[PDB]
Design a protein around this motif. Structure first.
Motif, PDB file in Angstrom:
ATOM      1  N   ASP A  99       0.832  -1.198   0.000  1.00 24.25           N
ATOM      2  CA  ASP A  99       0.000   0.000   0.000  1.00 24.25           C
ATOM      3  C   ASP A  99       0.870   1.254   0.000  1.00 24.25           C
ATOM      4  O   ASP A  99       0.565   2.255   0.649  1.00 24.25           O
ATOM      5  N   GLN A 150      -2.528   4.450   1.453  1.00 25.62           N
ATOM      6  CA  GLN A 150      -2.540   3.676   2.691  1.00 25.62           C
ATOM      7  C   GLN A 150      -3.847   2.914   2.857  1.00 25.62           C
ATOM      8  O   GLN A 150      -4.932   3.461   2.645  1.00 25.62           O
ATOM      9  N   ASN A 201      -0.505  -1.715   9.810  1.00 25.05           N
ATOM     10  CA  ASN A 201       0.272  -0.487   9.601  1.00 25.05           C
ATOM     11  C   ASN A 201       0.969  -0.031  10.885  1.00 25.05           C
ATOM     12  O   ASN A 201       0.954   1.144  11.258  1.00 25.05           O
ATOM     13  N   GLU A 208       4.785   0.577   7.619  1.00 23.58           N
ATOM     14  CA  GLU A 208       4.520  -0.770   7.109  1.00 23.58           C
ATOM     15  C   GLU A 208       3.688  -0.729   5.847  1.00 23.58           C
ATOM     16  O   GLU A 208       2.457  -0.684   5.913  1.00 23.58           O
ATOM     17  N   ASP A 209       4.342  -0.776   4.693  1.00 23.81           N
ATOM     18  CA  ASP A 209       3.628  -0.664   3.436  1.00 23.81           C
ATOM     19  C   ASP A 209       3.907  -1.783   2.449  1.00 23.81           C
ATOM     20  O   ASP A 209       3.411  -1.717   1.318  1.00 23.81           O
TER      21      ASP A 209
HETATM   22 CA    CA Z   1       0.670   0.760   5.067  1.00 24.66          CA
END
Ligand code: CA
Ligand code: MFU
Ligand code: CA
Length: 126
Positions: free
Chosen positions: A68, A72, A95, A99-100
């Motif tokens: 993402d 997001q 997330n 954190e993607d």
């Molecule tokens: Ca994310």
């Protein structure tokens, strides 16, 4: 007819390779692109079970193409295919770290969002 290159495993029309070297998500993607592919996308339970059973095997955690980065909480495959199937760990994506990028970890092949700069093995698809 046409075949996968050596060390790429065929499954339902596509070729798959475990990249053992631990790299960031972006670095793993660039390596897949250099090999003519992209990070793994997973569109069915059958493809997930092939991945966990034959490609990932004993490796505990590795990068796949879901992310993402652009928007997001809206995950997409780096290769541009549709998200028709997911297999998240319970309470993921969360997330957490601000954190993607997405990993597979554990024996059931469930998914987790992770900091993209973590060094992990990956899987390419072609
Ligand atoms: Ca994310
Ligand atoms: C609490 O969050 C979970 O545990 C952390 C150690 C991270 O692995 C995180 O990505 C995961 O979602
Ligand atoms: Ca997470």
């Amino acid at each position: 007819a046409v075949e996968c290159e050596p060390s790429w495993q065929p499954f339902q029309g596509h070729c798959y390779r475990l990249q053992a070297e631990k790299r960031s998500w972006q670095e793993s993607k660039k390596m897949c692109l250099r090999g003519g592919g992209d990070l793994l996308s997973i569109h069915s339970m059958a493809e997930l079970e092939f991945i966990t059973k034959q490609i990932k095997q004993e490796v505990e955690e590795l990068w796949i193409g879901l992310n993402d980065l652009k928007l997001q909480m809206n995950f997409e495959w780096s290769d541009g295919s549709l998200v028709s199937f997911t297999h998240w760990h319970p309470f993921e994506p969360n997330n957490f770290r601000d954190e993607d990028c997405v990993t597979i970890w554990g024996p059931e092949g469930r998914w987790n969002d992770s900091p993209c700069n973590q060094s992990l093995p990956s899987i390419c698809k072609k």
